[PDB]
């Protein structure tokens, strides 16, 4: 924060290396999921059961 620097040593900041690629991994299950059987079903059960 000045226009003049005295003789010596100084410490300013830090450095970090950057990545270059993106990787994702998931299991290979490919079955359609049965949400249909419950949401639009015909008759629902009773509260006490």
């Amino acid at each position: 924060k000045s226009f003049t620097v005295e003789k010596g040593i100084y410490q300013t900041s830090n450095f970090r290396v950057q990545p270059t690629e993106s990787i994702v991994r998931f299991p290979n299950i490919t079955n359609l999921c049965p949400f249909d059987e419950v949401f639009n079903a015909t008759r629902f059960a009773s509260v006490y059961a």
């Binding site: 249909d36 059987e37 639009n40 079903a41 015909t42 008759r43």
Partner: protein, 108 residues
């Protein structure tokens, strides 16, 4: 998908006899069945609308029972005024509906 089967395809009997019929399914469907009768003509008719519950306005010569995937219908005393077509159908999805195949009856 849901698929039915009926058995046997046809049978014949005489008056005053017990008759039976079987309807089978590929997976349990929890007693949501019914049967339809349709004589040669125009209008199919509702006969039994549950596992063992019958529609009003029909005499008491009919019975039937079942659960899981095993379902049987029967008539205790055949009468000559019974020559028609029969079917079993099911329902568990809001719309995925299908009838069976067909059962034939003939008199002696």
């Amino acid at each position: 998908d849901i698929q039915m089967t009926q058995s046997p395809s046809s049978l014949s009997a005489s008056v005053g006899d017990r008759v039976t019929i079987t309807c089978q399914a590929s997976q349990d469907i929890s007693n949501y069945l019914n049967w339809y009768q349709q004589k040669p003509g125009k209008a199919p008719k509702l006969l039994i609308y549950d596992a063992s519950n019958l529609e009003t306005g029909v005499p008491s010569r009919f019975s039937g029972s079942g659960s899981g995937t095993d379902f049987t219908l029967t008539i205790s005393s055949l009468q000559p005024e019974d020559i028609a077509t029969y079917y079993c159908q099911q329902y568990k999805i809001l719309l995925t509906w299908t009838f069976g195949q067909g059962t034939k009856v003939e008199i002696k």
